[PDB]
């Protein structure tokens, strides 16, 4: 223990050295490890140094032959900021004959504490006694931090590869060896960690990171190994920690992460206990046991499978897909109340005239309606009575057989009763007018100013390039004429930054939805004919048969077909039907959810893209269904159709006679 | 003997990024055995 007095001696002298030392400016003196690594002398992948395989011992260790420890393994990434080296157990009693403190590697005295310890301050003390170090540029909170991570690392390097890292790891000489190391990496060659950059507002972009989970349970805290900040997981992560996947002490890899409560700079040490970072599930995927805390090489965001996307949070930073399908533009409308409405072009041009027409009549009807608001016993005892009340005095002059010839038969007070019920009538009219205007004019300015809320959308059916698939949907709002012609079916792109994968709808929860935001970019990558055919099934114009065999889900149910119309039918009560017959005199029906595209008159070559199967097939009376994404045509130029049509254009340019009629007989009987 | 002073250690960061790795679906070897979480397991 010592007579406990030879310690301040060692301390006042320790304290003096620093004293003088910081009283100046001097020449740098890179530490042991900094001058080593700093050169050539071949390095050694933290991997290679272990044959490649994470841990190699479990339970109570295969044994503590080589070298383990107690009060060292029973330690955490939240208490290493305290460890405390029992000065007594690492030098023994042979070096303890020295009550002037233990001199240490790199130059610089680490003086045990009265209490027999060697904690934070001790090292902060030494690290200041350390040659080539200016104690003005470091400080207790600085060493603190680092004394934490520089430990947990070593410690951890213990219960893990006991066979290659004895205790030749946690000695107080690799701690003061590293603390010096960091002071070289960061205070000398002034190289800044990943989070120190970010926090200090010098790279912020939360671009591809490799961090590590520390404290956890509303939010957790990640680290780059040097400094640490409190992240902000989204619901789906909130679940992966509450379930136990993000195991404090593991490496992940976020992408577009970001900051909240982040005014400007600040040194990660004076880190506002408010500010937080925002990891986002879809843009985070665990990283190997080894890696490299900090920013990562390929600055280019990493892709991944839709199959793996979630929905309670995050945008995907990148997705490597193939444009399976491509639908026609939709002219959506947001109803004054709630709910959104979808309309083809033909429909949002019909509706666009049906409105701006109606509600342009209302704008005049307000005025057409205000335009139509402009243009017995002796008459002597009588004239005296019907003179008192002015109200009846007026009356008595209007419904008067004779005009101003009667009011000249009374020139008294009762001629000032009429002329007082006269001018009160004007300031009654003049009131309505003035008001009746305004009242209207003001209700039209409340008319003419209301408009339909219409924007447009483009849906694409895409699938991850990486085998199998989960063809989800990509919606692109107000698609620039460019975008529109760049994306084509059966191609590859790497779309980056796609809308917060908003969940789909209609029945169950499989698959997901993609929307592109203003910061999405489309990079078209190539594909080999030879390796396309796995995922990408081109558009095919069925030979009509398929709809028969209980084995041909035919791509998400959509089919495109060709044929001739036998007869239209518009069932009283809405829900038209169109009977088409192909070349093998096969029949099916198209139920119309929209409006007949004109040309669909009985017996005409009709092509059609985008039709959905309906239940109960296998009955000669198939049942396709025309929705919003349906196209139709009397003269399709498209490929896949070209054949199957020349084919059906055959029995029309062949018999042409007993054909259409027989079909009629075919269909006529099935009824 | 592995000269630590030579070991390309875990936290030796690369400031200038512009001088396999991540696994697709979150939960499905290397993402199991973390050289740092175990001291948490015991
Ligand atoms: Hg070590
Ligand atoms: Hg900051
Ligand atoms: Hg499909
Ligand atoms: Hg045929
Ligand atoms: Hg079908």
XYZ file of C-alpha atoms and ligand atoms in Angstrom:
718
model
C 0.000 0.000 0.000
C 2.865 2.412 0.957
C 3.127 4.720 3.974
C 0.769 6.639 1.626
C 3.095 9.639 1.572
C 5.523 8.781 -1.220
C 2.572 9.257 -3.546
C 1.940 12.978 -3.405
C 5.691 13.331 -3.772
C 5.379 11.396 -7.063
C 2.247 13.455 -7.699
C 3.494 16.910 -7.044
C 6.428 16.159 -9.376
C 3.997 14.552 -11.850
C 1.805 17.620 -11.540
C 4.737 19.924 -11.956
C 5.968 18.298 -15.218
C 2.563 18.781 -16.733
C 2.590 22.269 -15.190
C 5.760 23.247 -17.025
C 4.898 21.126 -20.045
C 1.590 22.876 -20.771
C 3.296 26.170 -19.962
C 4.555 25.699 -23.527
C 4.696 24.563 -27.145
C 7.033 21.730 -28.065
C 7.752 19.211 -30.777
C 5.450 16.320 -31.465
C 6.456 12.802 -30.682
C 4.103 10.284 -32.262
C 3.585 7.419 -29.863
C 4.640 3.798 -30.056
C 1.730 2.437 -32.213
C 1.365 5.589 -34.206
C 4.943 5.402 -35.510
C 4.578 1.663 -36.154
C 1.395 1.610 -38.186
C 2.591 4.895 -39.719
C 5.089 2.999 -41.822
C 5.343 -0.031 -44.096
C 5.935 -3.014 -41.816
C 2.981 -5.181 -43.124
C -0.257 -4.971 -41.144
C -2.612 -7.798 -40.260
C -6.358 -7.953 -41.023
C -8.075 -8.309 -37.646
C -9.510 -11.254 -39.535
C -6.425 -13.191 -40.693
C -5.175 -12.932 -37.122
C -7.859 -15.508 -36.306
C -8.002 -17.951 -39.218
C -11.416 -16.368 -39.963
C -14.323 -17.354 -37.689
C -15.394 -15.125 -34.798
C -15.142 -16.726 -31.249
C -13.407 -20.042 -30.369
C -14.439 -20.681 -26.742
C -17.718 -20.725 -24.782
C -19.112 -21.498 -21.265
C -16.403 -21.107 -18.573
C -13.957 -20.801 -21.464
C -12.491 -23.989 -22.864
C -10.433 -22.962 -19.794
C -8.399 -19.992 -18.580
C -5.062 -21.604 -19.595
C -3.601 -18.803 -21.688
C -5.237 -15.985 -19.713
C -8.670 -14.625 -18.749
C -9.819 -12.433 -15.847
C -12.473 -11.526 -13.278
C -14.087 -8.067 -12.731
C -12.911 -7.736 -16.361
C -15.204 -10.212 -18.108
C -18.008 -9.263 -15.634
C -17.779 -5.819 -17.401
C -19.861 -3.847 -19.964
C -19.808 -1.229 -22.755
C -21.439 1.060 -20.179
C -19.083 0.700 -17.206
C -15.607 0.522 -18.809
C -15.482 4.288 -18.370
C -14.675 3.175 -14.800
C -12.811 -0.208 -14.804
C -10.020 0.670 -12.279
C -6.703 -1.195 -12.580
C -5.778 -2.798 -9.239
C -2.247 -1.448 -9.609
C -1.326 -4.370 -7.362
C -2.286 -7.227 -9.743
C -0.512 -6.193 -12.949
C 3.028 -5.381 -11.836
C 2.971 -7.786 -8.891
C 5.117 -6.762 -5.910
C 8.500 -6.720 -7.708
C 7.783 -3.373 -9.362
C 5.734 -2.333 -6.287
C 8.999 -1.831 -4.365
C 8.812 1.399 -6.377
C 6.739 3.980 -4.505
C 7.583 6.667 -7.064
C 4.917 5.294 -9.431
C 5.119 2.912 -12.398
C 6.974 4.444 -15.378
C 5.258 3.525 -18.624
C 5.606 2.728 -22.277
C 5.986 5.868 -24.416
C 7.399 7.937 -21.618
C 4.987 9.088 -18.939
C 4.161 8.109 -15.355
C 0.962 6.281 -14.331
C 0.810 6.730 -10.587
C -1.456 4.365 -8.675
C -4.049 6.032 -6.472
C -3.850 5.947 -2.665
C -6.817 3.526 -2.777
C -4.725 0.978 -4.704
C -6.468 1.832 -7.964
C -5.482 3.023 -11.480
C -8.604 4.599 -12.995
C -9.525 7.309 -15.445
C -7.761 10.252 -13.807
C -4.601 8.177 -13.298
C -4.350 7.702 -17.043
C -5.365 11.310 -17.735
C -2.555 12.215 -15.359
C -0.020 10.004 -17.172
C -1.193 10.896 -20.626
C -0.148 14.421 -19.633
C 3.176 13.322 -18.215
C 3.525 11.583 -21.628
C 6.200 13.140 -23.878
C 4.986 14.753 -27.073
C 1.622 15.504 -25.472
C 0.285 18.957 -24.640
C -2.140 18.731 -21.693
C -3.953 21.874 -22.870
C -5.325 19.930 -25.833
C -6.656 16.986 -23.893
C -8.841 17.009 -20.784
C -10.453 14.632 -18.340
C -13.725 14.289 -20.198
C -11.684 13.588 -23.297
C -9.643 10.743 -21.783
C -12.777 9.494 -20.035
C -14.551 8.793 -23.269
C -11.608 7.141 -24.799
C -10.676 5.195 -21.684
C -14.105 3.638 -22.157
C -13.911 2.360 -25.720
C -10.190 1.622 -25.655
C -11.134 -0.778 -22.879
C -14.314 -2.511 -24.012
C -12.363 -3.169 -27.213
C -9.467 -4.829 -25.478
C -11.720 -6.546 -22.935
C -13.887 -7.857 -25.763
C -10.722 -8.916 -27.555
C -10.530 -11.263 -24.573
C -13.624 -13.396 -24.187
C -13.413 -14.101 -27.886
C -10.004 -15.269 -29.160
C -8.312 -16.310 -25.885
C -5.948 -18.339 -28.043
C -4.468 -15.256 -29.790
C -5.168 -12.499 -27.253
C -4.080 -13.500 -23.789
C -4.225 -10.663 -21.293
C -1.454 -9.185 -23.416
C -4.497 -7.105 -24.308
C -5.874 -5.428 -21.178
C -2.545 -4.350 -19.584
C -2.363 -0.686 -18.531
C 0.316 -0.286 -21.177
C -1.817 -0.737 -24.256
C -4.342 1.617 -22.723
C -1.839 4.427 -22.209
C -0.451 3.193 -25.471
C -3.636 3.822 -27.334
C -4.801 6.894 -25.529
C -1.566 8.291 -26.881
C -2.469 6.729 -30.155
C -5.768 8.622 -30.337
C -4.099 11.889 -29.289
C -1.951 11.341 -32.352
C -4.692 10.360 -34.705
C -6.988 13.178 -33.548
C -5.105 16.018 -31.792
C -1.876 15.830 -33.885
C -2.464 14.785 -37.484
C -5.877 16.179 -36.680
C -7.828 13.345 -38.287
C -11.486 13.256 -37.096
C -13.690 10.249 -36.378
C -16.863 9.666 -38.371
C -19.243 11.027 -35.790
C -16.955 13.866 -34.788
C -17.066 15.048 -38.406
C -20.827 14.728 -38.573
C -21.479 16.350 -35.220
C -18.964 19.109 -35.837
C -21.008 19.676 -39.021
C -18.223 18.796 -41.544
C -19.638 15.782 -43.475
C -23.086 15.481 -41.848
C -24.320 13.452 -44.816
C -25.187 10.299 -42.877
C -24.081 8.321 -45.954
C -23.064 4.678 -45.488
C -21.881 4.147 -41.921
C -20.664 1.243 -39.836
C -21.549 1.973 -36.231
C -22.019 0.001 -33.071
C -24.789 -0.314 -30.482
C -24.012 0.711 -26.913
C -26.614 1.770 -24.283
C -30.341 1.023 -24.751
C -35.522 1.386 -23.724
C -36.873 4.244 -25.868
C -33.773 4.671 -28.036
C -30.284 3.185 -28.191
C -26.843 4.750 -28.542
C -24.424 3.874 -31.337
C -20.685 4.494 -31.653
C -18.006 4.722 -34.344
C -15.658 3.525 -31.668
C -14.482 7.032 -30.926
C -17.526 9.024 -29.955
C -21.123 7.948 -29.548
C -24.516 9.424 -30.237
C -28.089 8.463 -29.407
C -29.849 7.202 -32.507
C -33.578 7.035 -33.247
C -34.912 3.751 -34.490
C -38.188 3.521 -36.340
C -40.968 1.189 -35.233
C -39.556 -1.948 -37.022
C -36.231 -1.473 -35.237
C -38.038 -0.693 -32.002
C -39.184 -4.272 -32.478
C -35.795 -5.776 -33.390
C -34.263 -4.600 -30.130
C -37.304 -5.438 -27.965
C -37.002 -8.918 -29.515
C -33.235 -8.943 -29.137
C -31.455 -8.741 -32.478
C -29.592 -5.485 -32.011
C -27.387 -6.838 -29.261
C -25.533 -3.941 -27.621
C -22.124 -4.562 -29.023
C -22.902 -5.310 -32.616
C -22.093 -3.696 -35.940
C -24.752 -2.424 -38.385
C -24.604 -0.323 -41.583
C -27.059 2.537 -42.071
C -27.527 4.745 -45.043
C -29.449 7.953 -45.353
C -29.503 8.324 -41.544
C -30.047 11.876 -40.326
C -30.066 14.434 -37.594
C -32.732 16.021 -35.447
C -32.120 18.635 -32.735
C -28.889 19.445 -34.546
C -28.241 23.145 -34.818
C -24.567 23.253 -35.709
C -21.090 22.093 -34.737
C -20.080 21.126 -31.181
C -17.538 18.575 -30.064
C -19.233 15.160 -29.661
C -18.250 15.509 -26.007
C -20.417 18.583 -25.442
C -23.126 16.567 -27.241
C -26.574 18.088 -26.472
C -28.458 15.433 -24.504
C -31.370 16.120 -26.902
C -29.911 15.730 -30.429
C -30.339 12.261 -31.915
C -29.662 10.400 -35.127
C -32.292 8.561 -37.184
C -31.557 5.044 -38.392
C -34.198 3.583 -40.717
C -34.761 -0.170 -40.891
C -35.018 -0.546 -44.674
C -31.707 1.297 -44.806
C -29.882 -0.760 -42.163
C -28.608 -4.341 -42.338
C -26.268 -5.892 -39.715
C -22.537 -5.886 -40.560
C -19.924 -8.632 -39.978
C -18.189 -9.242 -36.568
C -15.244 -7.331 -38.002
C -15.590 -4.326 -40.247
C -14.616 -0.838 -39.493
C -16.596 1.495 -37.384
C -16.868 4.797 -39.245
C -17.575 5.809 -42.804
C -17.360 2.961 -45.341
C -15.466 2.720 -48.699
C -18.163 2.319 -51.394
C -19.923 5.713 -50.908
C -22.492 4.405 -53.352
C -25.557 3.261 -51.418
C -26.099 -0.462 -51.136
C -29.139 -2.149 -52.745
C -31.108 -5.125 -51.416
C -34.477 -7.085 -51.937
C -38.014 -5.770 -51.722
C -38.690 -9.136 -50.245
C -36.829 -7.788 -47.195
C -38.338 -4.322 -46.926
C -40.646 -3.532 -44.053
C -43.129 -0.726 -43.755
C -43.189 1.089 -40.412
C -40.161 3.139 -41.483
C -37.319 4.145 -43.761
C -36.880 4.751 -47.467
C -34.813 2.238 -49.359
C -31.533 3.814 -50.353
C -31.296 1.677 -53.408
C -33.036 -1.263 -55.011
C -31.811 -3.222 -57.986
C -34.944 -4.087 -59.961
C -36.363 -5.017 -63.314
C -39.370 -3.315 -64.829
C -41.706 -6.296 -64.953
C -44.812 -4.365 -66.000
C -45.675 -0.826 -66.938
C -49.212 0.608 -66.796
C -50.722 3.757 -68.394
C -50.903 7.113 -66.600
C -53.666 7.745 -64.082
C -55.240 11.151 -63.364
C -55.976 10.939 -59.608
C -58.360 13.301 -57.766
C -58.448 14.173 -54.054
C -62.058 14.512 -52.947
C -62.877 17.577 -50.922
C -63.626 15.229 -47.976
C -61.198 12.269 -47.885
C -60.668 9.263 -50.205
C -58.770 9.631 -53.516
C -60.262 8.851 -56.964
C -58.590 7.238 -60.028
C -59.493 8.063 -63.628
C -58.025 7.149 -66.989
C -57.245 9.957 -69.399
C -60.455 9.608 -71.249
C -62.275 9.794 -67.887
C -60.347 12.737 -66.416
C -61.061 14.670 -69.589
C -64.717 13.738 -69.559
C -64.917 14.620 -65.888
C -62.813 17.697 -66.662
C -65.390 18.956 -69.107
C -68.398 17.746 -67.091
C -67.212 19.949 -64.234
C -65.746 23.124 -65.710
C -69.054 23.146 -67.606
C -71.550 22.651 -64.828
C -69.680 24.869 -62.454
C -69.508 27.755 -64.946
C -73.321 27.757 -65.128
C -73.486 28.073 -61.360
C -71.197 31.124 -61.777
C -73.797 32.796 -63.969
C -76.906 31.313 -62.349
C -75.943 33.422 -59.334
C -76.587 36.455 -61.529
C -79.280 35.153 -63.856
C -81.208 34.850 -60.575
C -80.520 38.382 -59.366
C -81.309 39.838 -62.776
C -84.890 38.659 -62.325
C -85.461 41.150 -59.518
C -85.537 44.332 -61.628
C -88.640 45.690 -63.482
C -119.820 52.756 -50.288
C -119.778 56.226 -48.583
C -117.946 59.267 -50.128
C -114.251 59.569 -50.991
C -114.001 62.513 -48.539
C -114.433 60.974 -45.056
C -112.242 58.322 -46.695
C -109.485 60.601 -47.877
C -109.312 62.010 -44.291
C -108.982 58.557 -42.663
C -106.743 56.912 -45.304
C -104.500 59.828 -44.463
C -103.497 59.058 -40.880
C -101.281 55.977 -41.308
C -98.587 56.628 -43.975
C -98.345 52.910 -44.715
C -101.947 52.929 -46.007
C -101.402 56.451 -47.350
C -98.933 55.129 -49.934
C -101.191 52.197 -50.740
C -104.012 54.660 -51.261
C -101.993 56.505 -53.893
C -100.623 53.526 -55.793
C -103.760 51.408 -56.140
C -105.158 54.889 -56.863
C -107.602 55.373 -59.717
C -106.052 58.834 -60.014
C -102.331 59.734 -59.394
C -100.828 63.030 -58.124
C -104.377 64.418 -58.384
C -105.322 62.810 -55.057
C -102.178 63.594 -53.073
C -102.980 67.187 -53.927
C -106.154 66.719 -51.863
C -104.067 66.510 -48.675
C -101.221 69.014 -48.018
C -100.771 68.685 -44.228
C -98.913 66.477 -41.734
C -100.446 63.473 -43.451
C -98.545 64.401 -46.629
C -95.396 64.114 -44.581
C -96.451 60.676 -43.464
C -96.536 59.374 -46.988
C -93.320 61.197 -47.920
C -91.861 59.558 -44.875
C -93.133 56.108 -45.776
C -91.970 56.877 -49.273
C -88.308 57.532 -48.567
C -88.190 54.655 -46.061
C -89.179 52.391 -48.949
C -86.221 53.535 -50.950
C -83.818 52.958 -48.095
C -85.285 49.469 -48.107
C -84.758 48.821 -51.838
C -81.346 50.510 -52.021
C -80.577 48.159 -49.123
C -81.514 44.955 -50.973
C -79.745 46.011 -54.135
C -76.417 47.004 -52.553
C -76.696 43.836 -50.469
C -78.174 41.556 -53.080
C -75.071 42.340 -55.188
C -72.213 41.749 -52.705
C -74.259 38.757 -51.399
C -73.909 37.289 -54.942
C -70.677 38.740 -56.283
C -69.198 37.523 -53.005
C -70.573 34.013 -53.435
C -69.163 33.729 -56.968
C -65.673 34.752 -55.891
C -66.192 31.763 -53.582
C -67.224 29.755 -56.631
C -64.814 30.737 -59.388
C -62.005 30.081 -56.920
C -62.653 26.395 -56.243
C -60.857 23.833 -58.419
C -60.534 20.072 -58.832
C -57.417 18.742 -57.127
C -55.790 16.773 -59.939
C -52.289 15.368 -60.198
C -51.100 12.318 -62.173
C -49.441 8.912 -61.395
C -47.425 6.140 -63.080
C -47.407 2.595 -61.731
C -44.644 0.131 -62.604
C -44.450 -3.505 -61.571
C -40.791 -4.078 -60.728
C -38.901 -6.978 -59.054
C -35.486 -7.376 -57.420
C -32.857 -8.512 -59.943
C -31.741 -11.123 -57.429
C -33.747 -14.256 -58.317
C -37.238 -15.191 -57.163
C -38.994 -11.923 -56.468
C -41.889 -10.158 -54.730
C -42.942 -7.891 -57.621
C -44.174 -4.870 -55.735
C -45.427 -1.629 -57.179
C -43.560 1.574 -57.972
C -45.633 4.712 -58.179
C -44.077 7.799 -59.743
C -46.052 11.006 -59.424
C -46.120 13.642 -62.151
C -43.550 11.726 -64.264
C -41.241 14.013 -66.266
C -41.578 13.306 -70.022
C -38.000 12.009 -69.646
C -38.572 9.465 -66.919
C -41.561 8.318 -68.901
C -39.422 7.245 -71.865
C -36.380 6.037 -69.972
C -38.115 3.275 -68.080
C -39.236 0.513 -70.441
C -40.462 -2.992 -69.698
C -37.929 -5.752 -69.315
C -34.962 -3.672 -68.218
C -32.771 -3.079 -65.289
C -32.382 -0.019 -63.203
C -31.110 0.793 -59.810
C -33.532 3.233 -58.408
C -32.088 5.015 -55.410
C -34.002 6.736 -52.636
C -37.564 5.469 -52.996
C -40.470 6.616 -50.846
C -40.928 5.266 -47.331
C -42.104 1.925 -48.722
C -45.750 2.663 -47.900
C -47.835 -0.468 -47.287
C -50.138 -1.736 -50.050
C -53.854 -2.482 -49.701
C -56.862 -4.637 -50.696
C -57.304 -7.906 -48.700
C -54.067 -9.365 -47.205
C -50.589 -7.954 -46.322
C -47.992 -9.657 -48.575
C -45.654 -7.575 -50.855
C -45.120 -3.787 -50.476
C -45.402 -0.408 -52.286
C -42.713 1.864 -53.776
C -43.157 5.599 -54.463
C -40.473 7.899 -55.774
C -39.762 11.161 -54.021
C -38.077 14.299 -55.392
C -34.678 12.846 -54.529
C -34.987 9.534 -56.392
C -32.631 8.937 -59.249
C -32.878 6.154 -61.839
C -29.666 4.548 -63.044
C -30.197 2.064 -65.861
C -27.852 -0.929 -65.649
C -27.484 -3.684 -68.271
C -28.696 -7.281 -68.386
C -27.682 -10.370 -70.342
C -30.334 -11.888 -72.562
C -29.172 -15.238 -71.189
C -29.888 -14.256 -67.551
C -33.052 -12.218 -67.953
C -35.525 -15.046 -68.586
C -35.496 -16.129 -64.931
C -37.423 -13.207 -63.383
C -38.591 -11.274 -66.457
C -41.575 -12.842 -68.272
C -42.439 -10.573 -71.221
C -45.993 -9.565 -72.048
C -47.840 -12.429 -73.771
C -51.172 -12.341 -75.664
C -52.756 -15.652 -74.560
C -54.100 -18.155 -77.074
C -57.312 -18.096 -75.022
C -56.887 -21.670 -73.830
C -54.743 -20.981 -70.717
C -57.654 -19.493 -68.743
C -58.768 -23.155 -68.610
C -55.945 -25.102 -66.902
C -55.713 -24.710 -63.061
C -51.987 -24.089 -63.532
C -51.222 -20.654 -65.076
C -51.711 -17.855 -62.513
C -50.268 -15.951 -65.480
C -48.276 -13.162 -63.844
C -50.122 -11.606 -60.885
C -53.378 -12.491 -62.775
C -53.091 -9.918 -65.560
C -53.570 -11.082 -69.104
C -53.722 -9.312 -72.464
C -55.836 -10.760 -75.236
C -57.144 -10.507 -78.764
C -60.364 -11.295 -80.499
C -63.569 -10.305 -82.146
C -66.643 -9.096 -80.429
C -69.652 -11.351 -80.909
C -72.007 -9.120 -78.955
C -71.947 -6.312 -76.419
C -74.390 -6.319 -73.582
C -75.187 -3.445 -71.229
C -77.242 -5.072 -68.423
C -79.824 -2.714 -67.005
C -78.282 -1.585 -63.745
C -74.698 -0.946 -64.810
C -71.819 -3.427 -65.436
C -71.487 -3.916 -69.216
C -70.153 -7.146 -70.726
C -68.184 -7.712 -73.892
C -68.200 -11.093 -75.534
C -64.993 -11.816 -77.371
C -64.247 -14.857 -79.443
C -60.773 -15.810 -80.642
C -59.668 -18.010 -83.546
C -60.467 -21.401 -81.994
C -64.038 -20.191 -81.573
C -63.400 -19.862 -77.844
C -65.301 -17.354 -75.836
C -64.688 -15.225 -72.788
C -66.177 -12.111 -71.373
C -64.802 -8.821 -70.275
C -66.694 -7.209 -67.382
C -66.328 -3.419 -67.683
C -65.619 -1.368 -64.574
C -64.927 1.683 -66.740
C -66.561 3.124 -69.904
C -66.575 1.325 -73.271
C -63.787 2.735 -75.450
C -66.156 3.568 -78.372
C -64.891 1.281 -81.098
C -65.926 -1.855 -79.149
C -68.884 -2.349 -81.504
C -70.116 -5.888 -82.192
C -67.636 -7.824 -84.378
C -64.332 -5.919 -84.550
C -60.752 -6.978 -84.114
C -60.061 -5.951 -80.559
C -56.733 -6.017 -78.677
C -56.510 -5.361 -74.943
C -53.737 -4.945 -72.390
C -54.222 -5.280 -68.642
C -57.164 -7.587 -67.830
C -57.774 -9.377 -64.497
C -59.116 -12.968 -63.984
C -62.336 -13.479 -62.030
C -63.397 -16.531 -60.001
C -65.088 -19.654 -61.373
C -63.253 -20.172 -64.638
C -63.394 -23.580 -66.405
C -66.927 -23.115 -67.804
C -66.686 -21.923 -71.426
C -67.773 -18.582 -70.010
C -64.385 -17.188 -68.823
C -64.347 -13.776 -67.226
C -61.684 -11.127 -67.669
C -62.258 -7.687 -66.086
C -61.398 -4.241 -67.401
C -60.179 -1.807 -64.803
C -58.440 1.512 -64.843
C -55.224 0.276 -66.274
C -56.909 -1.353 -69.243
C -56.024 -0.260 -72.747
C -57.995 -1.323 -75.843
C -57.619 -0.892 -79.603
C -58.875 -1.528 -83.095
C -55.336 -1.389 -84.482
C -52.670 -2.363 -81.936
C -49.100 -2.057 -83.227
C -47.606 -3.801 -80.208
C -45.486 -6.963 -80.735
C -46.708 -9.941 -78.710
C -50.148 -9.280 -80.206
C -49.106 -9.061 -83.894
C -49.263 -12.852 -84.325
C -52.329 -13.993 -82.355
C -54.221 -11.282 -84.222
C -53.128 -12.040 -87.814
C -54.263 -15.460 -86.629
C -57.748 -14.326 -85.683
C -57.721 -11.913 -88.580
C -57.532 -15.179 -90.549
C -60.928 -16.831 -90.013
C -62.300 -13.340 -90.722
C -60.445 -13.066 -94.039
C -61.143 -16.775 -94.731
C -64.686 -18.137 -94.279
C -65.832 -14.753 -92.946
C -69.288 -16.160 -93.709
C -70.360 -19.120 -91.541
C -67.962 -17.727 -88.955
C -69.367 -14.814 -86.960
C -72.809 -16.401 -87.366
C -71.754 -19.730 -85.817
C -69.975 -17.996 -82.947
C -73.304 -16.361 -82.389
C -74.744 -19.856 -82.317
C -71.934 -20.871 -79.959
C -72.515 -18.013 -77.532
C -76.302 -17.929 -78.138
C -76.704 -21.482 -76.734
C -74.431 -21.118 -73.691
C -77.064 -18.618 -72.507
C 3.233 -13.939 -31.726
C 0.876 -11.418 -33.382
C 2.509 -7.954 -33.135
C -0.480 -5.849 -32.055
C 1.335 -2.777 -33.200
C 0.660 -4.221 -36.615
C -2.891 -5.426 -36.254
C -5.281 -3.543 -38.643
C -7.616 -2.880 -35.712
C -11.360 -2.519 -35.515
C -11.590 1.243 -34.910
C -8.865 2.439 -37.238
C -11.182 4.617 -39.218
C -10.805 6.005 -42.693
C -11.671 9.697 -42.842
C -11.474 9.916 -46.638
C -13.774 7.048 -47.761
C -13.108 7.665 -51.482
C -9.466 6.592 -51.064
C -20.170 -9.659 -48.683
C -20.382 -6.885 -45.993
C -24.183 -6.537 -45.462
C -26.749 -9.346 -45.638
C -29.986 -8.789 -47.537
C -33.037 -9.441 -45.287
C -32.589 -8.402 -41.698
C -33.228 -11.712 -39.880
C -32.209 -14.934 -41.685
C -22.681 -16.590 -39.175
C -20.715 -13.334 -39.253
C -23.681 -11.217 -38.110
C -24.128 -13.535 -35.123
C -20.727 -13.536 -33.418
C -19.902 -9.918 -32.629
C -16.386 -9.286 -31.318
C -17.982 -7.042 -28.717
C -21.467 -8.156 -27.713
C -20.359 -11.328 -25.955
C -18.855 -9.488 -22.986
C -22.505 -8.529 -22.696
C -23.744 -12.113 -22.856
C -21.740 -13.119 -19.739
Hg -4.657 -6.411 -27.643
Hg -23.776 18.739 -33.006
Hg -47.651 -9.247 -62.888
Hg -57.515 -22.907 -84.973
Hg -56.233 -16.082 -64.704
